Amino acid sequence: TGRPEWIWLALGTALMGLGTLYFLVKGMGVSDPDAKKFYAITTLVPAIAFTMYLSMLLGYGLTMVPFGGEQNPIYWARYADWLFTTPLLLLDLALLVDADQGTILALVGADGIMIGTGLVGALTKVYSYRFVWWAISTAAMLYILYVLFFGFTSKAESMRPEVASTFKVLRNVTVVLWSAYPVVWLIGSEGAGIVPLNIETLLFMVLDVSAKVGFGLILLRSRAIFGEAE
Amino acid sequence: TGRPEWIWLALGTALMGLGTLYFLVKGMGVSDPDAKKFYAITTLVPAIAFTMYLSMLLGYGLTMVPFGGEQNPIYWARYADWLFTTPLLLLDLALLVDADQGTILALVGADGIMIGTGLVGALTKVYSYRFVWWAISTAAMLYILYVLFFGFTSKAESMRPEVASTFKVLRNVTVVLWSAYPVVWLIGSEGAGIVPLNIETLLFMVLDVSAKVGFGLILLRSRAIFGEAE
Amino acid sequence: TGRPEWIWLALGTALMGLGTLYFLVKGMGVSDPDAKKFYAITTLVPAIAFTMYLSMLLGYGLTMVPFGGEQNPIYWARYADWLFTTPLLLLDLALLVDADQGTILALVGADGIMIGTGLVGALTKVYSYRFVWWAISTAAMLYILYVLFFGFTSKAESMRPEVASTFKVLRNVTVVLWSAYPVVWLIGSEGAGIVPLNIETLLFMVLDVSAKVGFGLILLRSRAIFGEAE
Ligand SMILES: CCCCCCCC/C=C/CCCCCCCC(=O)OC[C@H](O)CO
Ligand SMILES: CCCCCCCC/C=C/CCCCCCCC(=O)OC[C@H](O)CO
Ligand SMILES: CCCCCCCC/C=C/CCCCCCCC(=O)OC[C@H](O)CO
Ligand SMILES: CCCCCCCC/C=C\CCCCCCCC(=O)OC[C@H](O)CO
Ligand SMILES: CCCCCCCC/C=C\CCCCCCCC(=O)OC[C@H](O)CO
Ligand SMILES: CCCCCCCC/C=C\CCCCCCCC(=O)OC[C@H](O)CO
Ligand SMILES: CCCCCCCC/C=C\CCCCCCCC(=O)OC[C@H](O)CO
Ligand SMILES: CCCCCCCC/C=C\CCCCCCCC(=O)OC[C@H](O)CO
Ligand SMILES: CCCCCCCC/C=C\CCCCCCCC(=O)OC[C@H](O)CO
Ligand SMILES: CCCCCCCC/C=C\CCCCCCCC(=O)OC[C@H](O)CO
Ligand SMILES: CCCCCCCC/C=C\CCCCCCCC(=O)OC[C@H](O)CO
Ligand SMILES: CCCCCCCC/C=C\CCCCCCCC(=O)OC[C@H](O)CO
Ligand SMILES: *C\C=C(C)/C=C/C=C(C)/C=C/C1=C(C)CCCC1(C)C
Ligand SMILES: *C\C=C(C)/C=C/C=C(C)/C=C/C1=C(C)CCCC1(C)C
Numbered sequence: 215t216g217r218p219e220w221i222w223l224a225l226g227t228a229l230m231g232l233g234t235l236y237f238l239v240k241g242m243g244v245s246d247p248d249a250k251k252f253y254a255i256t257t258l259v260p261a262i263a264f265t266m267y268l269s270m271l272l273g274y275g276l277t278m279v280p281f282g283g284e285q286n287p288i289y290w291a292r293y294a295d296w297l298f299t300t301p302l303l304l305l306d307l308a309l310l311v312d313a314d315q316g317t318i319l320a321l322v323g324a325d326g327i328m329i330g331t332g333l334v335g336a337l338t339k340v341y342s343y344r345f346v347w348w349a350i351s352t353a354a355m356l357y358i359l360y361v362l363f364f365g366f367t368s369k370a371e372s373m374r375p376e377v378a379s380t381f382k383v384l385r386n387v388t389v390v391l392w393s394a395y396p397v398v399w400l401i402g403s404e405g406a407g408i409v410p411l412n413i414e415t416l417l418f419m420v421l422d423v424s425a426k427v428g429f430g431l432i433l434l435r436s437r438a439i440f441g442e443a444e
Numbered sequence: 445t446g447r448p449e450w451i452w453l454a455l456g457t458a459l460m461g462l463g464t465l466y467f468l469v470k471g472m473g474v475s476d477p478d479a480k481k482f483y484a485i486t487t488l489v490p491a492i493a494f495t496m497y498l499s500m501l502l503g504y505g506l507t508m509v510p511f512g513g514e515q516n517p518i519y520w521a522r523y524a525d526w527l528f529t530t531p532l533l534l535l536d537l538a539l540l541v542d543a544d545q546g547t548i549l550a551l552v553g554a555d556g557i558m559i560g561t562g563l564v565g566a567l568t569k570v571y572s573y574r575f576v577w578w579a580i581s582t583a584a585m586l587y588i589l590y591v592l593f594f595g596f597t598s599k600a601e602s603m604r605p606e607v608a609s610t611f612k613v614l615r616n617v618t619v620v621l622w623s624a625y626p627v628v629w630l631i632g633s634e635g636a637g638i639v640p641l642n643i644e645t646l647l648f649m650v651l652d653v654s655a656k657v658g659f660g661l662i663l664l665r666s667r668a669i670f671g672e673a674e
Numbered sequence: 675t676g677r678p679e680w681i682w683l684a685l686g687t688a689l690m691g692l693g694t695l696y697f698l699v700k701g702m703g704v705s706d707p708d709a710k711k712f713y714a715i716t717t718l719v720p721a722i723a724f725t726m727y728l729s730m731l732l733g734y735g736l737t738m739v740p741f742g743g744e745q746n747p748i749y750w751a752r753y754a755d756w757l758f759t760t761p762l763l764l765l766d767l768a769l770l771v772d773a774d775q776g777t778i779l780a781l782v783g784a785d786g787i788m789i790g791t792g793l794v795g796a797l798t799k800v801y802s803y804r805f806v807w808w809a810i811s812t813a814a815m816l817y818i819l820y821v822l823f824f825g826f827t828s829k830a831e832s833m834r835p836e837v838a839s840t841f842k843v844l845r846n847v848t849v850v851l852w853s854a855y856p857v858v859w860l861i862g863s864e865g866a867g868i869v870p871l872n873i874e875t876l877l878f879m880v881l882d883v884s885a886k887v888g889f890g891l892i893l894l895r896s897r898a899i900f901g902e903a904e
């Protein structure tokens with residue numbers, strides 16, 4: 215409780231926990247093989263984020279990084295979280311439009327570079343270098359977003375209407391929510407330090423819960439995840 | 445030799461080494477594509493554990509963690525070992541009953557959460573928190589065990605008798621041997637400290653060798669791993 | 675610029691960057707599903723190595739390891755690089771000859787053991803033990819090389835001539851370039867220290883660029899990556 219951001223970490227933990235249990239129970243009994251894949255992927259995302267939010271709450275996922283003449287608290291657990299949950303979110307989208315194996319590999323690899331370089335930037339001690347890593351990480355994200363539009367949107371329009379409809383919604387949700395992440399990093403404690411840590415934690419918590427639980431609520435209520443059968 | 449547990453680490457190293465060479469030689473010449481998959485998965489498990497046991501023997505896979513007012517030796521290499529070998533063991537079982545891709549993902553993800561949270565619990569410095577992680581890790585294991593019974597056992601009974609027979613044996617071996625791990629952790633040096641480190645090392649060594657080499661001897665002598673062909 | 679090897683790190687960074695952009699642009703528009711897989715795998719290899727070379731250039735991927743009575747600079751970022759790029763290189767070869775899933779798993783697992791044990795050897799503080807890890811790592815490599823000859827070369831000769839032709843070239847390139855890595859390690863700063871660090875950096879840079887960009891130029895100009903169609 216000595217950390218003013220603790221309230222936002224406690225709430226994020228609870229929402230990810232509650233999201234995980236809901237998806238887990240809703241997924242009971244689903245026999246359709248296709249739907250089970252989406253339930254498996256989408257329930258795993260908040261389970262992972264739950265454990266990492268708890269580690270931040272309890273103080274484990276925190277470290278001090280000297281830069282700018284001060285010791286700055288850096289929650290490295292966020293990057294462990296994103297390293298495993300962001301490729302799962304992209305897999306949900308790719309399996310929806312039945313993307314080829316080469317495009318999937320491109321997306322997951324670019325995603326691993328995005329999060330990995332963001333982690334290096336967060337732990338870098340030379341101030342100016344942190345923004346070099348931020349730029350490479352942001353470059354990788356632009357590739358992802360380009361694929362989701364001028365690489366995926368065309369394949370969805372040649373499939374069942376419920377798939378094209380649900381993909382377009384989740385695509386739009388993804389592009390909006392993902393693009394906010396590099397901004398909060400840059401003006402927050404990891405970058406320019408304009409926004410205090412307790413408010414940055416609040417902002418990441420809203421985005422994290424929307425992009426994981428909110429994403430899952432939309433997808434798992436759709437007919438797109440079920441095969442077309444009689 | 446200054447560590448009394450060294451004898452159990454030297455023996456575990458030798459048994460994993462010897463297990464690896466046996467499986468490797470036995471796997472020579474096997475042309476059946478199905479059998480080669482099981483040989484590949486099952487020989488990799490003791491190769492990985494061999495390298496990590498050796499690192500513990502040589503003192504690399506060891507660190508000191510202050511908690512309870514003392515410096516406690518923690519063999520972190522065990523979790524690196526289990527992180528890579530336990531999903532391979534589950535893959536052996538899943539491919540046997542030809543489980544769907546969504547169930548496989550659920551098992552491997554839950555398994556990664558189980559080992560990952562066990563690692564955090566082992567390195568946690570606040571005593572009471574170590575058991576919070578132990579509980580989350582144990583919760584993930586119960587999900588795995590539930591899948592192996594009320595998720596897999598039903599699919600094996602609808603397949604070739606030799607597959608149903610071999611799966612049931614390996615399932616039973618797995619549930620018994622895996623369930624002992626959380627107990628040794630709790631009463632051992634990582635938890636309550638009731639059992640001394642040298643005896644905990646002995647107990648993990650017996651379980652490790654049984655669940656990896658013993659598991660492999662049963663599976664790789666079975667007809668289930670071979671396709672049904674003339 | 676206080677590190678004499680910086681020139682070789684700056685050049686390696688540039689060549690991996692330039693290699694990545696070339697493959698990325700050349701891969702634009704390729705619609706053939708098979709070719710897209712190879713373009714995806716092969717463009718990812720220099721993208722990863724670019725980021726790790728940059729981390730070495732900027733001083734992040736460097737640490738000091740006491741052994742032999744001195745503090746020795748160890749670029750641990752090389753192993754992070756190789757951990758992710760070497761299995762991708764092997765996947766390029768395996769998909770070319772359409773290898774079975776069990777052989778692929780064997781190659782990637784043996785490759786992960788090779789790099790992982792090389793990392794432990796590099797960070798080991800007991801001098802004699804560094805060569806124990808070097809030997810296990812080299813043993814795993816011999817298994818890989820054996821598979822590429824007496825495991826793959828036979829499957830390529832039963833396929834389209836352009837595949838057999840391109841595989842044989844890339845196989846030969848791989849065996850020659852990979853086998854040099856354990857030698858430079860042994861006589862370089864990580865081992866016997868006969869060759870100074872600045873020259874070891876030069877040697878790894880030539881090998882790294884040849885085995886990644888050079889490899890990719892040969893493969894991606896071949897007809898083998900395209901399906902046979904009218
Ligand atoms: C879905 C229904 C619920 C929607 C909810 C969306 C909330 C997302 C945004 C929150 C920003 C909050 C900003 C709070 C800033 C407080 C910091 C502060 O005190 O700033 C003044 C400072 O002391 C001197 O400049
Ligand atoms: C497969 C054929 C072989 C089967 C073999 C199975 C062995 C597994 C169990 C071993 C427990 C050994 C327990 C040894 C405990 C010694 C600790 C000790 O000395 O305890 C007394 C203490 O000094 C004051 O209370
Ligand atoms: C593809 C076209 C280009 C091909 C290019 C291939 C280069 C690869 C090998 C370089 C070795 C360079 C060795 C340089 C050694 C200098 C170290 C030195 O000064 O050694 C003397 C020392 O001072 C007292 O013994
Ligand atoms: C000076 C230049 C330095 C280097 C530039 C910064 C590198 C990091 C940024 C982005 C990753 C780029 C994407 C990497 C993955 C590309 C995969 C690919 O080529 O995919 C083609 C496939 O056909 C699709 O379906
Ligand atoms: C198909 C699979 C594709 C997979 C693609 C993966 C790409 C990873 C690339 C770059 C990020 C590397 C980040 C490494 C950061 C290590 C930080 C660390 O552990 O630092 C230790 C200590 O704090 C200081 O030395
Ligand atoms: C498509 C998604 C793209 C996402 C990526 C967009 C990146 C650029 C955005 C904002 C940078 C704005 C400038 C921030 C730097 C301000 C530095 C400074 O000095 O700020 C002082 C402050 O304004 C008072 O104290
Ligand atoms: C307050 C509550 C906090 C949260 C609870 C503790 C979370 C960690 C424990 C267990 C992981 C649960 C399992 C995660 C993976 C589930 C995958 C799934 O839903 O699989 C359905 C599929 O149909 C199958 O074949
Ligand atoms: C389909 C793929 C599914 C993959 C599912 C993976 C789930 C991983 C989740 C939680 C464990 C995270 C554990 C992270 C522990 C890091 C410990 C560490 O490195 O600590 C450094 C230092 O000792 C102190 O700061
Ligand atoms: C299905 C598989 C389930 C596996 C998981 C089962 C977990 C519960 C088991 C044992 C806990 C027993 C209590 C341990 C705590 C004892 C604390 C204590 O004070 O012990 C003093 C000691 O007995 C003298 O010194
Ligand atoms: C004392 C002996 C100690 C132990 C020896 C050193 C272990 C590490 C070295 C090499 C890894 C060996 C290869 C591991 C993977 C083998 C996979 C396999 O068996 O593959 C068969 C499949 O049929 C193929 O297609
Ligand atoms: C199909 C998938 C197959 C995957 C096969 C993977 C095999 C990995 C095995 C051994 C390498 C382990 C190396 C671990 C090195 C850890 C070093 C480290 O982080 O050390 C921290 C600190 O510097 C000191 O305690
Ligand atoms: C197929 C690929 C195989 C690749 C693996 C091949 C490994 C063996 C090669 C070289 C070792 C040569 C001996 C190196 C040890 C020399 C130690 C020493 O004392 O060197 C002094 C120096 O020569 C003056 O100062
Ligand atoms: C789990 C929820 C989501 C939407 C996570 C996404 C995270 C990112 C898109 C992170 C992006 C970063 C960039 C692009 C630049 C470096 C800083 C970040 C790692 C935050
Ligand atoms: C390699 C052999 C086996 C059977 C390894 C299995 C390891 C586990 C089942 C570990 C379980 C843990 C739990 C459930 C709770 C935290 C402590 C552990 C990581 C030991």
Ligand SMILES: *C\C=C(C)/C=C/C=C(C)/C=C/C1=C(C)CCCC1(C)C
Binds near residue numbers: 789
């Ligand atoms: C990215 C380019 C290539 C060819 C990388 C390959 C790296 C290896 C083959 C590393 C081999 C090692 C061995 C075999 C022994 C321990 C030291 C190394 C990790 C360098």
